[PDB]
């Protein structure tokens, strides 16, 4: 039972390494130490040993590496690395001596420079601002035209989706996707779903309309995205426009949506905009009592995930596990 227990039992086998820059926060050190007791990941604590000494009390962070930006033996490599990408903005060479003191920035760069598989922060830092440094240093992947935030949504006592589990996107970051984002989000989401849920993605591109039923500007920015998509990733099951019932309910799909590759079996939900995306996930979580995991970022070169201002050592452990499974994508 449970997305996250499955995810961490797979991370235990991937042997990925994640950086944790928030070493002046307690729950982070609890995570590291739990992470290592369980074999979920090797870990690098970007921080300060003296500071961490009187934070990690009855905890064993021995197995974990400790890296200090202002001491660490490749410091000037990381600074050179940073200045080169950011120099286009009129930022000086020593101004990389700023920014690259941030354990966050330092952590993110270790990932880029191959020294780590991914990074997880944002526990008491800031939830829009882990993304910029991730964007500054790492940026998008390959067939990733953009990025995205998705949620995993597991509905209890549920038969629809992948035994109750869906990916919803974008439900967390991208506010007004174009026809071409909704496109690219659909494709990235299918691969993300597939890696993380280990089931065949069947993508419903959601609307108030089911293939024909209504016609407006919105409906036109959907069928469009369906068709663009159906054609970037032709081996992928994609279909639209589909209402939620057509998408997941077969007996409805068997009137509204005959011969659909997805209608009736959908397990990925792609939303027109973040109003729809966010509203929908919250309704799933709060009214349908779904467990929601996210926001999780997709489409970056290395997985860098941002946390929530109020969550537990046990949550951070799980975020790290998810990131490990994401890093498996590029093996």
Ligand X SMILES: *SCCNC(=O)CCNC(=O)[C@H](O)C(C)(C)COP(=O)(O)OP(=O)(O)OC[C@H]1O[C@@H](n2cnc3c(N)ncnc32)[C@H](O)[C@@H]1OP(=O)(O)O
The binding site for ligand X (CB under 6 A) comprises 126-128, 131, 149, 172-173, 208, 213, 243, 245, 278, 292-295, 297, 306-308, 311, 315
Please name the residues in contact with 295: beta carbons below 8 A apart, sequence gap of 6 or more.
149, 150, 151, 171, 172, 173, 306
Binds 280, which of ligand X, a second copy, none (CB < 5 to 8 A, cut-off by type)? a second copy
Distance CA 325, CA 193 (A): 11
Least separation in angstroms between residue 156's CB and a second copy is 10
Choose among 220, 264, 221, 218: nearest CA to 239: 264
Binds 284, which of ligand X, a second copy, none (CB < 5 to 8 A, cut-off by type)? a second copy
Q: What is the 3-state secondary structure (H, E, C) of 57-108?
A: CCCCCCCCEEECCCCCCCHHHHHHHHHHHHHHHCCCCCCCCCHHHCHHHHHH
In the three-class reduction of DSSP (H, G, I as helix; E, B as strand; rest coil), residue 209 is classed as coil
CA angle 223, 224, 230 (to 5 degrees): 85
Least separation in angstroms between residue 43's CB and ligand X is 17
Residue 114 or 310: the one with the smaller Cβ distance to ligand X is 310
Residue 24 or 273: the one with the smaller Cβ distance to a second copy is 273
Query: For a second copy, which stretch binds (CB under 8 A), given 10-18, 44-52, 209-217, 299-307?
Result: 209-217
Residue 24 or 245: the one with the smaller Cβ distance to ligand X is 245
Question: What are the Cα distances from residue 177, in Å, to 120, 184, 289, 313?
Answer: 25, 9, 28, 34
Choose among 169, 172, 129, 121: nearest CA to 307: 121
Question: What are the Cα distances from residue 39, in Å, to 10, 34, 177, 322?
Answer: 10, 9, 39, 14
Binds 47, which of a second copy, ligand X, none (CB < 5 to 8 A, cut-off by type)? none
218 forms part of the interface with a second copy (CB under 8 A): yes
288 forms part of the interface with a second copy (CB under 8 A): yes
93 forms part of the interface with a second copy (CB under 8 A): no
188 forms part of the interface with a second copy (CB under 8 A): no
186 forms part of the interface with a second copy (CB under 8 A): no
Residue 141: φ, ψ to 5°: -80, -75
Residue 278 or 305: the one with the smaller Cβ distance to a second copy is 278
Binds 158, which of ligand X, a second copy, none (CB < 5 to 8 A, cut-off by type)? a second copy
Q: What is the DSSP letter of 330?
A: G
206 forms part of the interface with a second copy (CB under 8 A): yes
Least separation in angstroms between residue 79's CB and ligand X is 26
Please name the residues in contact with 282: beta carbons below 8 A apart, sequence gap of 6 or more.
none
251 forms part of the interface with a second copy (CB under 8 A): no
Least separation in angstroms between residue 86's CB and ligand X is 21
User: Which pair of structure tokens corresponds to residue 261?
Assistant: 């590759």
Tell which one of 275, 312, 314, 330 touches a second copy (CB under 8 A): 275
Tell which one of 100, 155, 187, 224 touches a second copy (CB under 8 A): 155
Query: For a second copy, which stretch binds (CB under 8 A), given 35-43, 194-202, 205-213, 318-326?
Result: 205-213
CB-CB neighbours of 143 under 10 Å: 12
| Composition of the chain by helix, strand, coil, percent to 5 | 45, 15, 40
Distance CA 323, CA 305 (A): 7
Binds 307, which of ligand X, a second copy, none (CB < 5 to 8 A, cut-off by type)? ligand X
Which residues make up the interface to a second copy (CB under 8 A)?
155, 158, 160, 175-176, 206-208, 214, 216-218, 222, 243-245, 248-249, 271-280, 282-290
């Amino acid at each position: 039972v449970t997305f996250l227990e499955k995810i961490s039992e797979r991370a235990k086998k991937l042997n990925k390494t994640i950086a944790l820059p928030e070493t002046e926060d307690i729950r982070t050190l609890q995570a590291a130490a739990k992470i290592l007791e369980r074999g979920i990941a090797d870990i690098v604590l970007v921080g300060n040993e003296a500071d961490i000494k009187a934070l990690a009390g009855d905890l064993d962070l021995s197995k974990a590496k400790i890296v200090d930006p202002k001491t660490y033996e490749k410091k000037d490599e990381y600074i050179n690395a940073f200045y080169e990408l950011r120099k286009h903005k009129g930022i000086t060479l020593e101004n990389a001596a700023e920014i690259m003191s941030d354990y966050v920035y330092f952590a993110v760069m270790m990932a880029k420079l191959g020294e780590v598989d991914g990074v997880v922060s944002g526990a008491a830092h800031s939830s829009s601002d882990t993304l910029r440094p991730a964007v500054q240093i790492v940026k998008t992947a390959k067939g990733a035209a953009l990025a995205s935030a998705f949620f995993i949504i597991s509905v209890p006592d549920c038969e629809y989706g992948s035994d109750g589990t869906f990916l919803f996107a974008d439900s967390g970051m991208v506010e007004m996707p174009s026809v071409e984002d909704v496109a690219n989000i659909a494709v990235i989401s299918a691969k993300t779903f597939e890696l993380l849920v280990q089931d065949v993605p069947k993508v419903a591109m959601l609307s108030y309309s089911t293939k024909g039923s209504a016609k407006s500007k919105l409906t036109e920015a959907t069928i469009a995205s369906t068709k663009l998509a159906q054609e970037l990733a032709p081996d992928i099951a994609i279909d639209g426009e589909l209402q939620v019932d057509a998408a997941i309910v077969p007996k409805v799909a068997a009137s509204k949506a005959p011969g659909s590759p997805v209608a009736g079996k959908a397990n990925v939900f792609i939303f027109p905009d973040l109003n729809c995306g966010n509203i929908a996930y919250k309704i799933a979580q709060r009214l349908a009592k779904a467990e929601a995991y996210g926001p999780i970022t997709q489409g970056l070169a290395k997985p860098i995930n941002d946390l929530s201002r109020g969550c537990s050592d046990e949550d951070i452990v799980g975020a790290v596990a998810i990131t490990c499974v994401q890093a498996a994508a590029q093996d």
